[PDB]
Structure formats: structure tokens, C-alpha cells
Write a protein that binds this ligand. Structure first.
Ligand code: HEM
Ligand code: HEM
Ligand SMILES: Oc1ccc(Cl)cc1-c1cn[nH]n1
Ligand SMILES: Oc1ccc(Cl)cc1-c1cn[nH]n1
Ligand SMILES: Oc1ccc(Cl)cc1-c1cn[nH]n1
Lengths: 373, 371
């Protein structure tokens, strides 16, 4: 590939993000490094106003700028939702709203916490000379004590690094098609399916590191946005930056590029149709880094691997392509059982069928693309 | 400029489209070649219904499939809207709804008549040796006798080809910004500014071939879709392909790819934000051919030309960039004049859209180098 900011070892996630802003921004990071104690003791929402407007011009590196996107990303999320019980804040102060919105429009991201922030730029190696395992990694910023966000964010990242190992052979696939090298194409497609089968194994780790009570009842509120959300009926007001309140969608893993990249590579029409699911995934691309957004657009400009394999009438090539489509149906059927345990069941203990049909539609169209036609 | 299916003469349009399908589709072609006659005689719907279901497996090349799309697209709009007097059909019969939908998914386009059907693939040179001018061209299919569909389509197409001549220099803009070649970058922008300038002069031909009442009362209804239409509140049933009635937008020049690419090129954030205008132009992109959608998002992959120009302190450079933007404000201001003549005052003869054209006009005029 060219420079869509892809790391051969890590992929779309940010490789080794820096852990601390420059000492100018010390007073920012203070609220960011201490949100658990800060909102439990009720000291959070006013310490925001105690801040004065820092300028973004001394964040020199991309790693520096994106780390600041994370600290301001969570600082706003903790401000708007607060305790997490219903006390809502419908307007951000301006000494925090316009630093965020400026660096957001410089990085071309919406001024909200996106998946690229709280996962891809939100980790560190405990001991730098170890493998990237959950035992050796740690999240840089959490919202509340017992959030399980360490397990939730990193297990999310861990299977992203797992499937990103398949990105490296995507050029091999398109090479083998155009130069009509049948065998290497079949071994490239099998290696694609290997990673997605292993990303399902890494997905198993979420049971050990997140419990359903915490996720649904503390972590889910802090990651929800103010688009189509009654608590901020028509969005959040940005003092000094925008006249009116603007609506933005909360974090989703639909903003990850690998979890849309395999759907376009395999000719799976996730974004086709005027459907709710297609519109959701198409819109979530706006919440991806501009380099990653340009990477999906770049994949869509290639010939369909699905049409190539079906034309050749090769039982070998078709079985390998189905393996990838199967490995995706697996990752989404298993996700369905996890949404069952971590959202469905904790909701019946305090309408939501729309949540399950979306994920079933995205799997339904994935299952249709199998070479059973 | 790799194969985004942009010819250097006709641009986004289809270079020399096909007008005859194979003999296996005569029953389709007959209905399409006689849409006015079949509608005036009340015979159209009976002919569409008695159709046998035909396989799309004989449409081999891209052009044959584009003709059948425009063939089946027009027959569909004819069947749904009828004589145009409110007696609609909200169930498209199986024997036409299935081949239409199979073909549409094969070409990755909504199963409704789209701009790249009735315009970019709906033309024909009278004489193969003479240039592309209105008097040398003709449409392939029309709705009613006197609907001025020849004028409306061919003028829109000729305006597109005019602006399409600017597509060829877009590679030199981004390579000049790259190598920092100032003078060639200035000549490139002014060449864009001239092609946009000429397209406005081609636009003037609209008054000579489109009668205002025939458009508003006749042609505007055979181009309307079933998305937010009270006459088909929940869409149209594609009997035999989907259980449910689907909603789809009618033809609109928002589906034209020339007239969204220049806003992207010049850093005009027409699709930015979440407003209704930005989403309508974003929602209208799913109606472009797949190779044309790819061209737009790949332009977005490039650095912003506007911020580059704003950094140079080069008055000659800015005057050239502004020349492009002002030519877009001219085209949109003259459009607003046109919509008043061809829609507004015919409606008075027994604002939601006007605020849309003024919103996008203001967004363009905001990109003028004043900040
Ligand atoms: C307890 C854990 C999880 C819960 C409760 C959960 C819940 C959900 C929900 C509710 C959605 C619906 C979209 C929305 O409403 O925003 C969703 C979408 C999605 N989730 Fe998860 N999720 C979890 C873990 C994961 C992980 C670890 C991944 C991958 C790293 C993942 C990948 C996706 C993807 C790709 C979508 C978009 C729909 C699709 O492409 O199929 N999720 N998730
Ligand atoms: C009698 C002739 C015309 C009428 C009545 C007309 C009417 C309209 C209307 C109502 C819209 C808004 C979208 C909608 O409500 O569906 C629109 C948008 C548009 N029309 Fe036209 N139009 C005409 C001719 C043309 C021609 C010849 C072009 C050739 C370029 C053109 C280009 C556009 C474009 C690009 C838009 C999208 C908004 C924008 O990009 O600024 N139209 N037109
Ligand atoms: O895994 C995640 C990590 C961070 C954020 Cl903001 C969202 C997700 C997610 C998973 N499924 N839907 N959203
Ligand atoms: O849609 C996906 C594409 C790739 C990968 Cl690795 C995972 C998913 C997924 C997982 N859970 N729901 N969707
Ligand atoms: O110019 C056109 C040609 C064909 C079709 Cl379907 C629509 C338009 C149009 C222009 N402005 N609104 N719609």
C-alpha cells in the first residue's frame, strides 16, 4: 500500500502513541489523567471552567495532536454526561469548545470522542520489550473506577491488530488477479481468512476483561453521542465556535476502517442500498481519520474480487473466498451473542429490537455474498 | 487520470452510447421507442404487464447494460406515473421489476431512472462526423409528445461536456501544488475557470428548447421519484425482488458528477456538516455510476487547493482561484433564475427547494478568498 498511515505491525491503530502532552498543556492532561476521582467527588464540571483557553499551536506532531484529541475527547464526554445518572450539560464552555473544534477541523474529525481516539490512540506497552498482549498493555485514560474500559478498549484494539495482519496481503490479491496468477490468489485469500479466524479467537478475551454490569451501566453512557438523542434533543452547543448546537454520533466501532475494509474488499455491499445499516456505516466513515477514510475509497476503486472468483469457475478459488465470508459471519454472529449478554440482558433489569436487526442485517448481507449465490 | 470512466471529450457522459439492444429484447425496446404513443392511447400499462420476464444474461458489455437501464428506467417511470394525472401504480410487475433490479445491482445503481441514464447515456449524433452541438444531437427516448425532453436532456448534457473539458487539467493542479510550480498552477486554475465560464454560456440554450409549462406540467412528473412523495407514501413495490416497498429519489442533477467535483476540487465543503443540503448532495451520490463515485472521493484524498493558495500571498494566484469560485456562483445564480421561470411561476398558475439552491450558492460564495 501507499501512505494511508498503515503500520505493518499494528495497522490502522496509532503505533506507540505518546503518553504526555507538553508542559504547556499540563493543566489539560490533569483533568484527563484524573476523571475517575474528578466526577465521583463532583469536582469535574466546574474545573472545566477553571481552565483558561489554551492554544493548539504548540502541539507539533501528529502523535501529539491526536493525544490531545483524546484528552479533550474524554474531558467533554465526562462533562456532558457528568455522573452518568441524568444530569445533562447541553453546552460546552468556550475555553474548551474552540480548542477542540480547531484541532478537530485540522485533523478533519468531528469534535466528539471517536473510535480512533479512545482505542487507536489510547494504549501503551507496560514493558516496551514484550509482545502486544493484554497482560503487557494498559489504557491511558478511563472515565470511572471499575469502568472495565481497559478490557473493553484494548480487546477491541487487540482484534483490530489481529485482522490488520490481513491488510498487508491485500495488494497481493489485486496483483494476482490482474496478472492472472491463480495459485497465489488462492493462498492470499486463505491467509485473509486465517487472520479473521484468529481475530475471532482474540475476541473471546472480552469475557474475561469486561463484565456486563459495568459496561452497560457506566461505560455505555460516556461513549454515547448527541445525535438523535433526547437528552441533548438537537445537539450540543459549542460556545464561541458555532452559533447553534450541532449533532454528532457517539462512538462506535463502525468508525474503524478494518471493520469496513473487509466488506468492500470482498464485494460485500454493506454501504449499498438506502437502508438504515448502509446509511449508518457510510456515515460512520466521516468519523474515521482522513487517511483511513481515503483508504476505503481507494479499495472501492479496484475490481471486485467477488466477480473475478465467480467468473473463473474454480472450486479452489471459490472455497477460499467463502472462507473469508464465513470468517466474517462468524465474527458478527459471535458479536451478536456478546450484544445479547452486554446490552440485551442488562436492559431487562431496570424498542431494543432495532438494535438486533441492524446487526442481523449487516450479517444477513454478509451471508448473502457467499458463493452459494 | 486512470480509468474513472471519464472520457477526455465527453467527460462523465457515456462515449457514443448504444441505441439498439439485441433482438432478444424487442418487447422492451418497442415499449421504450413508443412511450408517448402508448401513454396517449392508454395502452402502456397493458403492454408492460403482458411482458414476459426476460433474462439480463444477454447484456454482455457495459453499454448494452446502460441502454437497458435507460430503457427499463423510462418504461418504469411511464408505468408508475401513467398519463400523469394522479392515477399511479405502486406495484411494478414482476416481469419488469426483476430484470430492472438484477441489472441495477449489477451496475450498482438504484432501480429508478437516474441522471446517468436519461442524460449521460441518452444521446445520439445525427452525423458521426460533425461536432457535439445541439443541432447535431438527439435523445434516444422521451415521455410525452411535446414534453421538451430533447431540450432538457441535451442542454444538460452539453453543459456537462463543457465543464467536462476542465476535468482533464485536474491532474496538473495537484502535481503543480506538489512540485510547487506556481505559473503552471495559475494557468491550470484559469483553464478551469474558462471551462466553467463557457458552460454558463451553453446553459443559455435552455430558453430555446424547453417551454416552461411543458416542463412543469409534463416532464417534471416523469422524473419524480418515490421518496418522500405523498402519492407513493411508502415507496414502490419491486414485485418479485423485495418483499417491501422501497423508497428512491427521482432524477436530479445532484446525481451529475461534474457539478459536485468542482466543489470538492476547490475545497467547497458542500457535503460537510449534517444539514439537509449537505446530505441531499451526499445522498445523491449513491445515484452516480460506481466509477463516478470513486472519482469524487479520490479527489477528497488530495490536499486542499484553497489552503495552498491562501498561504502564498500571490495575488495572481488568488485571482485565478476566485475566478473558478465566481464562475460557480454565476452558474448557480443563473440556475436560480431558471428555476423561477421553469418551476416557480408555473406553480403560481395553478421555497423548500429554493432555500436549498440558495444554501449551496451561499456555501460556494463563502469559499471566495475573503474568509
Ligand atoms: C461488550 C462488547 C460490545 C458491545 C456491547 C457491542 C455493541 C455494539 C452495538 C450495540 C453495535 C451497534 C451499532 C451502534 O448502535 O452504534 C455495535 C456495532 C459494531 N460492533 Fe460492537 N460491541 C461490542 C464489542 C465489539 C468489538 C470488540 C468489536 C470489534 C473490535 C465490535 C465490532 C462492531 C462493529 C464492526 C460494529 C458495526 C456493525 C457491523 O459492522 O457489523 N464490537 N456493537
Ligand atoms: C428547466 C430546467 C431546470 C430546472 C427546473 C431545474 C431545477 C432544479 C431543482 C429543483 C433543483 C433542486 C433539487 C431538487 O429539488 O430536486 C436543481 C438542482 C440542480 N440543478 Fe437544476 N434545473 C434545471 C436545469 C439544470 C441544468 C441544465 C443543469 C446543468 C448543469 C442543472 C444543474 C443542477 C445542479 C448541479 C443542481 C444541484 C444543486 C447544486 O449543485 O447547486 N440544472 N435543479
Ligand atoms: O470496541 C469499541 C471501542 C471504542 C468505541 Cl467508542 C466503540 C467500540 C464499539 C464496538 N462495537 N460498537 N462500538
Ligand atoms: O464487521 C466486521 C468486520 C471485520 C471484523 Cl475483524 C469484525 C467485524 C465485526 C465484529 N463484530 N461485529 N462486526
Ligand atoms: O438537468 C437534468 C437532467 C436530467 C435529470 Cl433526471 C435531472 C436534471 C436536473 C437538473 N436540475 N434538477 N434536475
Amino acid at each position: 500500500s501507499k501512505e494511508y498511515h498503515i503500520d505493518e505491525e499494528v495497522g490502522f491503530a496509532l503505533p506507540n502513541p505518546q503518553e504526555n502532552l507538553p508542559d504547556f498543556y499540563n493543566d489539560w492532561m490533569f483533568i484527563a489523567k484524573h476523571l475517575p476521582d474528578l466526577i465521583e467527588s463532583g469536582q469535574l464540571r466546574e474545573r472545566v471552567e477553571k481552565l483558561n483557553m489554551l492554544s493548539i499551536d504548540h502541539l507539533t506532531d501528529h502523535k501529539s495532536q491526536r493525544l490531545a484529541r483524546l484528552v479533550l475527547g474524554c474531558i467533554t464526554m465526562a462533562y456532558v454526561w457528568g455522573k452518568g445518572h441524568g444530569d445533562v450539560r447541553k453546552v460546552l464552555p468556550r475555553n474548551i469548545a474552540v480548542p477542540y473544534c480547531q484541532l478537530s477541523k485540522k485533523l478533519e474529525l468531528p469534535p466528539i470522542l471517536v473510535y480512533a481516539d479512545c482505542v487507536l490512540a489510547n494504549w501503551k506497552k507496560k514493558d516496551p520489550n514484550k509482545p502486544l498482549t493484554y497482560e503487557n498493555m494498559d489504557v491511558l485514560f478511563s472515565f470511572r473506577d471499575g469502568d472495565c474500559s481497559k478490557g473493553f478498549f484494548l480487546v477491541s484494539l487487540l482484534v483490530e491488530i489481529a485482522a490488520a495482519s490481513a491488510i498487508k496481503v491485500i495488494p497481493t490479491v489485486f496483483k494476482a488477479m490482474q496478472m492472472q496468477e491463480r495459485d497465489t490468489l488462492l493462498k492470499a485469500l486463505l491467509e485473509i481468512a486465517s487472520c479473521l479466524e484468529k481475530a475471532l479467537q482474540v475476541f473471546h478475551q472480552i469475557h474475561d476483561h469486561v463484565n456486563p454490569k459495568a459496561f452497560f451501566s457506566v461505560l455505555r453512557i460516556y461513549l454515547s453521542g448527541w445525535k438523535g438523542n433526547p437528552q441533548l434533543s438537537d445537539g450540543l452547543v459549542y460556545e464561541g465556535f458555532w452559533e447553534d448546537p450541532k449533532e454528532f454520533a457517539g462512538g462506535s466501532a463502525g468508525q474503524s476502517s478494518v471493520f469496513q475494509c473487509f466488506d468492500v474488499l470482498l464485494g460485500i455491499q454493506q454501504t449499498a442500498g438506502g437502508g438504515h445499516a448502509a446509511q449508518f456505516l457510510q456515515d460512520m466513515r466521516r468519523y474515521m481519520p482522513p487517511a483511513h477514510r481515503n483508504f476505503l475509497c481507494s479499495l472501492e476503486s479496484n475490481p471486485s474480487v467477488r466477480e473475478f472468483v465467480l467468473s473463473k469457475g474454480d472450486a479452489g478459488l471459490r472455497e477460499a473466498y467463502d472462507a473469508c465470508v464465513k470468517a466474517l459471519v462468524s465474527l458478527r454472529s459471535y458479536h451478536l451473542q456478546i450484544v445479547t449478554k452486554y446490552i440485551l440482558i442488562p436492559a431487562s433489569q431496570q424498542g431494543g429490537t432495532d438494535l438486533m436487526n441492524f446487526l442481523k442485517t449487516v450479517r444477513s448481507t454478509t451471508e448473502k455474498s457467499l458463493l452459494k449465490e
